[PDB]
Enzyme design. Structure first.
Site, mmCIF file in Angstrom:
data_model
loop_
_atom_site.group_PDB
_atom_site.id
_atom_site.type_symbol
_atom_site.label_atom_id
_atom_site.label_comp_id
_atom_site.label_asym_id
_atom_site.label_seq_id
_atom_site.Cartn_x
_atom_site.Cartn_y
_atom_site.Cartn_z
ATOM 1 N N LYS A 138 0.883 -1.267 0.142
ATOM 2 C CA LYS A 138 -0.025 0.416 -0.312
ATOM 3 C C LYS A 138 1.022 1.230 0.035
ATOM 4 C CE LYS A 138 -3.190 -2.657 1.417
ATOM 5 N NZ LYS A 138 -3.895 -3.905 1.567
ATOM 6 N N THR B 61 -22.627 6.761 12.749
ATOM 7 C CA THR B 61 -22.493 6.880 13.758
ATOM 8 C C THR B 61 -22.143 7.878 15.128
ATOM 9 O OG1 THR B 61 -20.601 5.143 13.598
ATOM 10 C CG2 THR B 61 -19.475 7.260 13.630
ATOM 11 N N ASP C 178 -17.972 19.066 26.219
ATOM 12 C CA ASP C 178 -18.889 18.182 27.466
ATOM 13 C C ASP C 178 -18.602 18.908 28.699
ATOM 14 O OD1 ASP C 178 -17.545 16.045 27.282
ATOM 15 O OD2 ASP C 178 -18.722 14.987 26.841
HETATM 16 MN MN LIG Z 1 -17.289 13.951 29.459
HETATM 17 MN MN LIG Z 2 -15.091 16.284 28.643
#
Ligand SMILES: [Mn+2]
Ligand SMILES: [Mn+2]
Length: 327
Positions: A64, A93, A182
């Site tokens: 490859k 996904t 988050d």
């Molecule tokens: Mn988290």
């Molecule tokens: Mn985080």
DNA sequence: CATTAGA
DNA sequence: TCTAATG
């Protein structure tokens, strides 16, 4: 770090594909160890056989590398890059709650798009249902400006419920960082530790409080020590509402917080680097404890920690402000 | 590397 | 129970 960039990059593209689209854990695992070593290689790999010399590099991968070195492209890479199916798995996904497993299944049924996703909301469980609901917001980065607001609220209630509660917003946020993905709140309380047989409520109470006042909007998953949810800042004096944010709260037995905390704050590198030192400095560090290394090879016995200090001290390092835990 | 959902 | 999914 760049001399072998493309080679490793391609290798990863390939690896990723096996692991997802197909179910080629091996091949997949193959591509990475490969990508792992060529990366470490100190010299511009000029040919197949050349790479070939490497551990991990077999005949298939070399081949490859040749084509890619030869021409600026890879066919197989080109073929997949185009293919709607694999395309579709890569996509689905993204939904929080959709792994490759389900991605494939959906695909099979013909759920390829986000709309399709909707028309069959029934086919999805709560998590995935929520994932879909918050699909845009789930992708959006969190401004520290917002992170500051958030953290403010949490800390406020926590305390209101129990004064004895210790909470830490860990991660990138902790580390100064401009934006974050988050929120992660580390949690512990004195009446909970290694031995003291639980107090689930300890988690539950706050979960409630948060909800009660509308910080928590939805529940992704909640157990006696780790809750996964969705939150949102009170939309001011209208004209502007806040995107829905992934938030994770976790209960820790007071006697492991700082290792715990230390840890999560990272950065992945700092960790390792910190961790590497603890080793020479005659210790062992991992997510919950730090135990003195015994000469026989190994040894146990969790040392006693009251702050991120105690740990530095231990391995006699410089206490590094989280700001600079960067590496 | 572990915790929660699920079916 | 195993298998999936997020971290
Ligand atoms: Mn988290
Ligand atoms: Mn985080």
């Amino acid at each position: 770090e760049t001399l072998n960039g493309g080679i490793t990059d391609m290798l990863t593209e390939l690896a990723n594909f096996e692991k997802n689209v197909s179910q080629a854990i091996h091949k997949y695992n193959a591509y990475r160890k490969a990508a792992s070593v060529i990366a470490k290689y100190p010299h511009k790999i000029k040919s197949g056989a050349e790479a070939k010399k490497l551990p991990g590099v077999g005949t298939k991968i070399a081949e490859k590398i040749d084509e890619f070195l030869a021409t600026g492209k890879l066919r197989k890479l080109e073929k997949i890059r185009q293919d709607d199916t694999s395309s579709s798995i890569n996509f689905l996904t993204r939904v929080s709650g959709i792994g490759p497993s389900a991605a494939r299944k959906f695909v099979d049924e013909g759920i390829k798009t986000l709309e399709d996703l909707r028309k069959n909301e029934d086919k999805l469980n709560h998590h995935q249902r929520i994932g879909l609901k918050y699909f845009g917001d789930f992708e959006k980065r969190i401004p520290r400006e917002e992170m500051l607001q958030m953290q403010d609220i949490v800390l406020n209630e926590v305390k209101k419920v129990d004064s004895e509660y210790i909470a830490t917003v860990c991660g990138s946020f902790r580390r100064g960082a401009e934006s974050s993905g988050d929120m992660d709140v580390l949690l512990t309380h004195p009446s909970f530790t290694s031995e003291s047989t639980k107090q689930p409520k300890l988690l539950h109470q706050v979960v409630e409080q948060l909800q009660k006042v509308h910080f928590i909007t939805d529940t992704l998953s909640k157990g006696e020590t780790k809750f996964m949810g969705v939150c949102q800042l009170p939309s001011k004096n209208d004209e502007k509402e806040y995107p829905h944010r992934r938030i994770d709260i976790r209960l820790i037995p007071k006697d492991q917080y700082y290792c715990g905390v230390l840890y999560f704050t990272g950065s992945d590198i700092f960790n390792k680097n910190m961790r590497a030192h603890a080793l020479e400095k005659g210790f062992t560090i991992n997510e919950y404890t730090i135990r003195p290394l015994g000469v026989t090879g190994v040894a146990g016995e969790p040392l006693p920690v009251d702050s991120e200090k105690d740990i530095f001290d231990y391995i006699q390092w410089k206490y590094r402000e989280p700001k600079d835990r960067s590496e």
